[PDB]
Amino acid sequence: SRYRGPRFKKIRRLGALPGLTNKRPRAGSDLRNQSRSGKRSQYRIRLEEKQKLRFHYGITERQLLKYVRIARKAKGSTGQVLLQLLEMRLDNILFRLGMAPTIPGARQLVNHRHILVNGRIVDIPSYRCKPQDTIMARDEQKSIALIQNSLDLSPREELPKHLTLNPFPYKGLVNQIIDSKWVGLKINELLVVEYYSRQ
Amino acid sequence: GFGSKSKKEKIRDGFEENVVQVRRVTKVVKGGKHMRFRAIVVVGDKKGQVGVGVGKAKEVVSAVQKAAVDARRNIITVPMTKYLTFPHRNEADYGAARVMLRPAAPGTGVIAGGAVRTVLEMAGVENALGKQLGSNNALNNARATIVAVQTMRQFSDVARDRGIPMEELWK
Amino acid sequence: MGKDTIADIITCIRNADMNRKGTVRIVSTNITENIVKILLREGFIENARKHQERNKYFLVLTLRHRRNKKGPYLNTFHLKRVSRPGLRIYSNYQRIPRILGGMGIAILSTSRGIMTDREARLEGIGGEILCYIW
Amino acid sequence: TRERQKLKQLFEDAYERCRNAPMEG
Amino acid sequence: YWNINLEEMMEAGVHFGHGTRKWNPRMSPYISAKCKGIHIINLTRTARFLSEACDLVFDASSRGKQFLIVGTKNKAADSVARAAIRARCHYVNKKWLGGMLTNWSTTETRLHKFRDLRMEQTAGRLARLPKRDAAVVKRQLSHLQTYLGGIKYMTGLPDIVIIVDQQEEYTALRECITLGIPTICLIDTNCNPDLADISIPANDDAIASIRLILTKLVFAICEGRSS
RNA sequence: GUUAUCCGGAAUGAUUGGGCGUAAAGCGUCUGUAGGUGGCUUUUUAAGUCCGCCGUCAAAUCCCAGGGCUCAACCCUGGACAG
């Protein structure tokens, strides 16, 4: 699905989901009740690291089991490799290049078939990019400057070291797989990895 | 009787505390049947420094902190050589709780049962896996891990003990 | 002189130092001589001496210690048999285990002689694992 | 600080109770 | 340097050990001989461990600390006090309480009351109250006089505690092992070298052997203060 | 979501991995057949054991690496440890 839903709920519960669904911080007129008082079971903590990951990328949870099985299946730090297989997801890159303000914005911006990759169109948000790729607009998007609106309001945050945004010819490419320091979201890999040990 | 114990509580950035169980244990008397609280507190910084402690008192919070003062005089340091994991596998029973600890790859958060996982997530190790063989208990379990990580040796002190100069180690 | 001549020496080692006594008297057969030869040179023990009592050549073996402690030897020795009589174990040069990463050794019976993991891993030969200590 | 000083003392003594049970006499 | 000639101990009651069928056999690689129902302690390792003893006493006072000595036996009762008034150390008079080292908070408050009662005993207001209050103050002041009269000059824990031989004070010794406080003590022919971590195995049947090792360590401490 | 079937958890059939004084459990004790295990030294064959090489264990599956379907599922090409 998309979850397509009320989302300041998820920001108040999970903590501030960075970039995804807002640059606006939560509870501009809210939070004036509901003392937590400090009781939270540890399973709630690991569950909130699931959904801190799952809402921040908009994944289906069954697909997140799929990415964990591939992450175990690869060789190396599974806590990091999970955040390589979920960074080189395409609409995360179009978010990170500022081609859309939010990640539902990027997912819808790639559903309606506005992205060529290496000159070929990719209609699917779960496309996993590679090193040395090419990410452009559509030919109609020099007449449909929605991407240029997003690139107009974007450039507070610059880019991490895989990206290379070309200003008017609108091309962004990733030099190499993103480093852990490079990952934008702040979370503990071990907490999430431990949670899926049960399966 | 100076008041409010502000300087005297020692704000506990140095040791973070958690309970692992608070069972109400009760004794009967001539008058009836009255209970006290036995709490088990595992103290420890994430540097590699933990220890258990039991306590019991008629209040909950005095039993927790009383178990903490019993706990913060009972500390071992964790032999944890590599990138926050274990030198070698180990097993050590205490009473009737046996605990198998096993070192892990760095892409593995700590996976163990609740008492073992509690004393390891307070021990600052990140990469272990410890099955528990035996009891459903929590105290003898955790204390069995503490005995199961005292008796654990690095490569530098085994190289020092045997006298062999150095090889057979990747790092 | 029971069933095993290797649980002879080995159980005399465990029973020796679990009572902290730093002195072993055992028989000196060929394989005991070979084990203490590949065991004094690996830093576990101190000295092995042959002598005779009624013209029966024995090994007295001095264990390691440290200084005046709660127990004068810190690292407990932890000797263990593997290939029991009646259940023989055999390994290739693949299965041959690095005990605790290498902090223990697995003395085993090659066609060469009896080696350790160092001296049977470089050879590429394999054979019957007598016992591993750690 | 006092606890640390105590620990240091205990180490000193254990080493002083480490140097000469070996050798000596 | 801190030497003792082998003949000064070998003449006196040092190898004059204890009973030949009471030996606790962790001295089996230690004890030299046995004669006439009395053990014979090896004097070489005795004097070497005393060399080590005075090295580790004089070094520890060379850092600058305060030492403690336990006196309880009533065979070596006043000899410790003679070995503690000149040596500046605080000492046990006759008898020990279980808790004077580990439970020292209540012992500290008990020294608040003992200090206040000595302040009232000196001030001359003792003869104000009749025989009831004077009787009670003399009784509790007598009991604290039995224990806390010899350690008024201590706050906190010492570094090295030297104890009456082994038998009567396993209590104080085990409080020292719980606190971790290193102790260097005397061993009989039938006791543990592994209770403390260095000790001095010599029989204490002789008063002059007790005066020997204690006098030796008294000059060790006083020369530790000599700075 | 419920149910059913199977494995896990279960070291709750235990080689890895349990027990038998009192918790379930040592035959009432003993002789001994079959069978099982067995002292030390030296020598011989190599059945076990180990090492090399060779043959085979179809293809498909699983594992690795590439490639194709807009990705994945799936399909395809090559390779191989085990054993």
Short mmCIF file of C-alpha atoms in Angstrom, two decimals, chain B residues 14-161:
data_model
loop_
_atom_site.label_atom_id
_atom_site.label_comp_id
_atom_site.label_asym_id
_atom_site.label_seq_id
_atom_site.Cartn_x
_atom_site.Cartn_y
_atom_site.Cartn_z
CA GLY B 14 27.96 7.06 35.21
CA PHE B 15 25.76 4.04 35.91
CA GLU B 16 22.44 3.63 34.15
CA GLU B 17 19.96 1.44 36.00
CA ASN B 18 17.11 -0.86 35.13
CA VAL B 19 15.06 -3.45 36.93
CA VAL B 20 14.77 -6.82 35.31
CA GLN B 21 12.02 -8.13 37.57
CA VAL B 22 10.20 -6.86 40.65
CA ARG B 23 8.49 -9.83 42.26
CA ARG B 24 6.46 -9.28 45.40
CA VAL B 25 7.68 -11.89 47.88
CA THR B 26 5.61 -12.40 50.96
CA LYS B 27 5.91 -13.92 54.40
CA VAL B 28 3.13 -14.82 56.78
CA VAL B 29 3.07 -13.83 60.43
CA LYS B 30 0.79 -14.29 63.42
CA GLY B 31 -1.16 -11.23 62.37
CA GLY B 32 -1.53 -12.37 58.82
CA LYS B 33 0.25 -12.20 55.52
CA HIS B 34 2.47 -9.29 54.57
CA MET B 35 4.58 -8.71 51.51
CA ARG B 36 7.82 -7.02 50.60
CA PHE B 37 9.19 -6.24 47.16
CA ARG B 38 12.20 -8.08 45.77
CA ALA B 39 13.60 -6.18 42.83
CA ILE B 40 16.59 -7.20 40.76
CA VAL B 41 18.55 -4.26 39.42
CA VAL B 42 21.34 -4.58 36.87
CA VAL B 43 23.63 -1.60 36.92
CA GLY B 44 26.34 -0.78 34.45
CA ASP B 45 27.73 1.74 32.05
CA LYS B 46 27.95 0.87 28.38
CA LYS B 47 31.75 0.97 28.72
CA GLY B 48 31.87 -2.68 29.73
CA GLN B 49 30.96 -2.43 33.39
CA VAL B 50 27.93 -4.24 34.91
CA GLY B 51 26.66 -6.14 37.90
CA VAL B 52 23.44 -7.50 39.37
CA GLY B 53 21.90 -6.85 42.75
CA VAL B 54 18.84 -8.02 44.61
CA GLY B 55 16.92 -6.09 47.19
CA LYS B 56 13.70 -6.27 49.11
CA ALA B 57 11.80 -3.67 51.08
CA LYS B 58 8.20 -2.79 51.75
CA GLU B 59 8.43 0.14 49.33
CA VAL B 60 9.03 -0.40 45.64
CA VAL B 61 11.49 2.41 45.00
CA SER B 62 13.55 1.80 48.12
CA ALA B 63 13.84 -1.82 47.05
CA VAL B 64 14.99 -0.80 43.58
CA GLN B 65 17.57 1.73 44.79
CA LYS B 66 18.55 -0.53 47.69
CA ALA B 67 19.25 -3.26 45.16
CA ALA B 68 21.16 -0.64 43.19
CA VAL B 69 23.43 0.22 46.11
CA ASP B 70 23.94 -3.52 46.54
CA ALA B 71 24.63 -3.66 42.82
CA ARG B 72 27.07 -0.76 42.43
CA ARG B 73 29.44 -2.40 44.90
CA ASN B 74 29.36 -5.55 42.73
CA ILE B 75 31.06 -4.84 39.39
CA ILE B 76 33.12 -6.80 36.97
CA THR B 77 34.57 -5.45 33.76
CA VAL B 78 33.71 -7.23 30.52
CA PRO B 79 36.54 -8.64 28.43
CA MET B 80 35.34 -7.37 25.04
CA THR B 81 38.27 -7.10 22.65
CA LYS B 82 37.02 -6.49 19.14
CA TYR B 83 34.39 -4.21 17.67
CA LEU B 84 32.13 -4.57 20.74
CA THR B 85 31.84 -8.35 20.85
CA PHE B 86 33.35 -11.34 22.57
CA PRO B 87 36.75 -13.04 22.47
CA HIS B 88 35.48 -16.62 22.38
CA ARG B 89 32.48 -18.69 23.28
CA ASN B 90 31.81 -19.54 26.88
CA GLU B 91 29.45 -21.48 29.07
CA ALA B 92 29.11 -21.31 32.83
CA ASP B 93 26.35 -22.43 35.12
CA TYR B 94 25.37 -20.99 38.46
CA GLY B 95 23.00 -22.97 40.60
CA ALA B 96 20.80 -24.56 37.97
CA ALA B 97 20.92 -21.92 35.26
CA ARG B 98 23.33 -22.67 32.45
CA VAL B 99 24.20 -19.94 29.96
CA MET B 100 25.90 -20.40 26.61
CA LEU B 101 27.44 -17.20 25.29
CA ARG B 102 28.77 -17.03 21.77
CA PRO B 103 30.50 -14.15 19.97
CA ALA B 104 28.89 -12.71 16.89
CA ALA B 105 29.57 -10.84 13.72
CA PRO B 106 29.24 -7.06 14.02
CA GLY B 107 26.07 -7.08 11.98
CA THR B 108 24.08 -8.73 14.78
CA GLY B 109 22.37 -7.01 17.66
CA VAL B 110 22.39 -8.80 20.99
CA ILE B 111 20.06 -11.77 21.00
CA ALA B 112 19.47 -13.54 24.30
CA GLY B 113 16.83 -14.13 26.90
CA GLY B 114 15.55 -11.23 28.94
CA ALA B 115 17.93 -11.45 31.89
CA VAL B 116 20.99 -12.26 29.79
CA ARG B 117 20.03 -9.63 27.24
CA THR B 118 19.50 -7.18 30.06
CA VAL B 119 22.97 -7.67 31.50
CA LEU B 120 24.54 -7.53 28.06
CA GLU B 121 22.69 -4.51 26.74
CA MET B 122 23.84 -2.82 29.90
CA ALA B 123 27.32 -4.25 29.34
CA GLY B 124 27.75 -2.29 26.14
CA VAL B 125 28.49 -5.36 24.07
CA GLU B 126 26.67 -5.10 20.78
CA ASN B 127 27.38 -8.35 19.01
CA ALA B 128 26.69 -11.49 20.96
CA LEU B 129 24.28 -14.36 21.00
CA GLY B 130 23.59 -16.22 24.20
CA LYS B 131 21.23 -19.13 24.57
CA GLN B 132 20.10 -20.02 28.07
CA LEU B 133 20.02 -23.71 28.95
CA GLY B 134 18.15 -24.56 32.11
CA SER B 135 16.10 -22.45 34.46
CA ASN B 136 13.26 -20.02 33.96
CA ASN B 137 14.84 -17.99 36.73
CA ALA B 138 16.04 -14.43 36.23
CA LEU B 139 18.47 -13.94 39.09
CA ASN B 140 20.57 -17.10 38.78
CA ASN B 141 20.37 -16.62 35.04
CA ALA B 142 21.91 -13.15 35.03
CA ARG B 143 24.39 -13.98 37.76
CA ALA B 144 25.31 -17.04 35.72
CA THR B 145 26.20 -14.80 32.80
CA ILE B 146 28.27 -12.63 35.13
CA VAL B 147 30.20 -15.73 36.13
CA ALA B 148 30.16 -16.62 32.42
CA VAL B 149 31.97 -13.43 31.48
CA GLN B 150 34.37 -13.20 34.38
CA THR B 151 36.22 -16.33 33.29
CA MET B 152 36.74 -15.08 29.76
CA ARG B 153 40.18 -14.24 28.41
CA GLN B 154 41.43 -11.97 25.64
CA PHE B 155 44.18 -12.94 23.24
CA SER B 156 46.72 -10.60 24.76
CA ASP B 157 46.61 -12.15 28.21
CA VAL B 158 46.54 -15.70 26.86
CA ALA B 159 49.51 -14.77 24.69
CA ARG B 160 51.03 -13.37 27.88
CA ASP B 161 50.19 -16.49 29.90
#
